[PDB]
């Protein structure tokens, strides 16, 4: 399938070259997979989600996304126009308040929630969790992400926006999850993207158009935007049967575009997420 005039990041993940604007992908499109977006919520009524999004948990007075961040990330995972995996099921877990903040204890509870809640959902092709959040190093946050991964969920986490080594941030520094850095439309490391040995992969993160609250759209930047590209890619590849939750991060790294990014520091992988779809 071909989506013309797609956001640059979608075109990038199906291309061996920057500078194109059509997204190519197998029509299965993540059907039968599920992606949990652990964030500020999801505006499930947005027409771009086509009824495939729902809120499953909140730790606050509402499950509504009063911020936009979670709706944007969910849109990159799976919206009809802005999403990688256009037929996946999206489940929102609101661990972040409407200012975008959340206590680590609530974030941990949300991760353990997903590990159990997947047993209440129909995801025959597999389960992914996208975590566009983080703070300073915490062994307990890392351990919660490790448990979620161990339970059979492909966990993708943002590397962070500190232009620093991700070793000092959590859950970015957890070895067993997929830590995602950000790139721009010219295949440069995004100026804010963290780096370091713990990164597994880069995805599009600068000037990413997606859904926003109020039935709207907007373009924003961050490793929070790169993470859902990778989460959606994992769901898409799992639906195709090319990988599993336990090995999807390594498979994405194996099949990535290699050595094409600039300003990647010595000791950080030079790998850009790529679906290897051949029309």
Distances (CA, A) of 19 to 56, 91, 121, 122: 38, 32, 39, 38
Q: How far apart are CA 30 and CA 171, in angstroms?
A: 25
Answer yes or no: is 278 within a domain: no
Q: Catalytic amino acids? A: 39, 69, 224
218 assigned to some structural domain: yes
Which of 25, 88, 87, 28 minimizes the C-alpha distance to 277? 25
Report the number of distinct structural domains present in the chain: 1
Method of determination is X-ray
Q: Is 16 annotated as a binding residue?
A: yes
114 is in an annotated binding site: no
What is the experimental resolution, given in Å to one decimal place?
1.1
The CA-to-CA distance between both ends of the chain, in Å, stands at 7
Residues 134-148 as b/e (b if ≥16 CB within 10 A, e otherwise) read bbeebeebbbbbbbb
What is the spatial distance between Cα 94 and Cα 67, in angstroms, rounded to a whole number? 11
Domain-embedded: residue 204 = yes
Q: Let me know if residue 235 belongs to a domain.
A: yes
Residues forming beta bridges with residue 216, ordered by sequence position: 212
231-242 residues labelled b (16+ CB within 10 A) or e (exposed):
bbbbbbbbbbee
Range of the domain at 128: 2-272
Q: What is d(CA 110, CA 28) in angstroms, rounded to the nearest whole number? A: 29
CATH number of the domain bearing residue 78: 3.40.50.200
In a domain, 99, yes or no: yes
Residue matched to tokens 């299965």:
28
In a domain, 193, yes or no: yes
What tokens does 279 get?
Answer: 């029309």
What does the chain come to in residues?
279
Q: Phi and psi (nearest 5°) for 271?
A: -140, 130
Answer yes or no: is 277 within a domain: no
175 labeled binding residue: yes
């Amino acid at each position: 399938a071909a989506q013309t005039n797609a956001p640059w990041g979608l075109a990038r993940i199906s291309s061996t070259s920057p500078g194109t604007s059509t997204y190519y992908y197998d029509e299965s499109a993540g059907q039968g997979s599920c992606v949990y977006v652990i964030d500020t919520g999801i505006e499930a009524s947005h027409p771009e989600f086509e009824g495939r999004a729902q809120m499953v948990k909140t730790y606050y007075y509402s499950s509504r996304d009063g911020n936009g961040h979670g709706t944007h990330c969910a849109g990159t995972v799976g919206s009809r126009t802005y999403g990688v995996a256009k037929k996946t099921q999206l489940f929102g877990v609101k661990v972040l308040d409407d200012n975008g903040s959340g206590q680590y204890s609530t974030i941990i509870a949300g991760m353990d929630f997903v590990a159990s809640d997947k047993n209440n959902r129909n995801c025959p092709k597999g389960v992914v969790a996208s975590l566009s959040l983080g703070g300073g190093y915490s062994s307990s946050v890392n351990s919660a992400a490790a448990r979620l991964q161990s339970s059979g969920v492909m966990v993708a986490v943002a590397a962070g926006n500190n232009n620093a080594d991700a070793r000092n941030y959590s859950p970015a520094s957890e070895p067993s999850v997929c830590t995602v850095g950000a790139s721009d439309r010219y295949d440069r490391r995004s100026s804010f993207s963290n780096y370091g040995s713990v990164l597994d992969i880069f995805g599009p993160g600068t000037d990413i158009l997606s859904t926003w609250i109020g039935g709207s759209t907007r373009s924003i930047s961050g490793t929070s935007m790169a993470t859902p590209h990778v989460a959606g890619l994992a769901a898409y590849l799992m639906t195709l049967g090319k990988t599993t939750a336990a090995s999807a991060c390594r498979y994405i790294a194996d099949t990535a575009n290699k050595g094409d990014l600039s300003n990647i520091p010595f000791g950080t992988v030079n790998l850009l997420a790529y679906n290897n779809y051949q029309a």
